[PDB]
Design a protein around this ligand. Sequence first.
Ligand SMILES: OC[C@H]1O[C@@](CO)(OC[C@@]2(O[C@H]3O[C@H](CO)[C@@H](O)[C@H](O)[C@H]3O)O[C@H](CO)[C@@H](O)[C@@H]2O)[C@@H](O)[C@@H]1O
Length: 634
Amino acid sequence: SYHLDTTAPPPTNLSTLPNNTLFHLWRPRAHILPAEGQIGDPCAHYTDPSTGLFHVGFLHDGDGIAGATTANLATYTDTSDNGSFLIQPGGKNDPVAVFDGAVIPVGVNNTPTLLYTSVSFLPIHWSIPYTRGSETQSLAVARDGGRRFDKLDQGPVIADHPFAVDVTAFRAPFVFRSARLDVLLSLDEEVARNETAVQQAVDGWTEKNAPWYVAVSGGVHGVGPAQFLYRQNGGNASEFQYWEYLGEWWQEATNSSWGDEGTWAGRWGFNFETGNVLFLTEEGHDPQTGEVFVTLGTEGSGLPIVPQVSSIHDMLWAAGEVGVGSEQEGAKVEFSPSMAGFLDWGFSAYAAAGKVLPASSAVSKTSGVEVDRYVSFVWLTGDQYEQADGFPTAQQGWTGSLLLPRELKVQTVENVVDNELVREEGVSWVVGESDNQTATLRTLGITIARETKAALLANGSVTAEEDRTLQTAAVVPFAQSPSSKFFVLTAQLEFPASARSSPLQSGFEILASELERTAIYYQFSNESLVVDRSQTSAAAPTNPGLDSFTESGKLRLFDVIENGQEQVETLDLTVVVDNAVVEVYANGRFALSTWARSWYDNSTQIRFFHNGEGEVQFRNVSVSEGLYNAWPER
Ligand SMILES: OC[C@H]1O[C@@](CO)(OC[C@@]2(O[C@H]3O[C@H](CO)[C@@H](O)[C@H](O)[C@H]3O)O[C@H](CO)[C@@H](O)[C@@H]2O)[C@@H](O)[C@@H]1O
């Protein structure tokens, strides 16, 4: 009889253990995930007009959308027991399955209304023929406080994909409002060609009565990934039955990519998934003044292609402009990217679903936020999108988790030396201004929702480390490491301009003991933050299900003028470890998340790391231990 003892070597085959034996071993305490079982794409979030509460949704066990609510964005309550499902398959419109959907706060009967993909046939994949009628978009209305969504007793409101278009996918509807879209669609084909006339109309746009837009994510066979745009018919904010097709407002060539190298924004792949239409400002989210941003997952593959398998799942984002529908019979409106990147560089991070969080929300009132925010929840698949090599699933009793809620806004990088590092082609930023001597850059800002970050540091024990400099290769253990796998690690690493050309690697080793360690370091060679998981788990060698491949993401440190002086921009790191869930944040404009399934309880040492190449200076290194409980009621 083998009882779990994590002070002793792991059994050779974890999959032989009894059910639920590994339930708590790698489970997080401050993240969003169901009480048990598997979690898929997060979805149906919305602020309830009546209560001001923020509702969170997510696919659960491949059997529908489950939910939970929060009043503070730090802590959550399940909407119900027995899975806490809001809506499940089996209706006339979704006999086979219920996929992602989005909510209009004041919809039918003036109640929260969910527009979702009702599935009638399987399988569905961009690499095989699409079965007509596979995915339609249906409506359901929130009842009993939103603890459940009742499907309207009629067929889908969008019963078919675009006429005669051979789509690769037609799902994940996302609703939004837009001053610019309303203006571009109201003005003349000629009167709307000039920003002057438009801007004047946008200034008068009134959100409260604007019509809703719907972006359905997908692609076209033999053509390319794309987003299909619709809007309440005739621009009638009161029309919920008929949705006029505005065309493929955004499409890219099959497996093409941002830039000529596919260096900063992966590839557009073969199919677009779970779109979000954001409107960001430097302070938050404004559908009247915000710049158009889009986050989406793209499904890619190497060659030869393996039918029904998407080998690459990129969690991307793009920003650009929207204009009138060229002159061709193309979309009435068109989104043109100016810059693009990754919302999260994690292999397993994917299907981001966010929502506008009004300053009028109970969450914001309580925390005192006076602007509208856009909160995004990234999915962290637990079994490499079901391609894991026999992960001990029955033993764990659950699969997957969502990452920490993140605030998305326009982030600026000031006092940046305008040089090659800034003018490169196909990057994740644009120059907002310049005098040819220094410039302000504009990119997507990615930060942990402020109430969540505060909650993480609420009751945490704080242990600081003295500023340090390393020149020769070295691994220096902290003066005091945490005694648990729940902590927030912060640190600033300063590099000399002479390091850009060096094969320098500097960072930390975490979750470490004699037989285990996880490395996190910056690498100038390819300007990337890297998470070496080759030694993360003592159990990985004999259990291939526990992926141990290296994770990395691109992060360029710009030459800037800090105190009237030039220097390589400081690497501002924040690593959050809710157990096996590791999230690496950098300079408010980067995120890389992965699983670090360390085995031993002793594996909690933290060390400074330097490979002797180049030089590094560590400043303001600190550790907050304990985090907090995201689900008190459980
Ligand atoms: O689960 C539905 C929901 O998932 C999204 C975001 O991940 O893409 C899903 C997709 O893959 C899932 O299902 C395949 C098996 O079909 C499984 O191998 C994979 O691991 C799962 O993530 O589901 C459809 C088909 O069932 C595939 O085309 C797609 O790759 C989102 O787009 C969808 O609403």
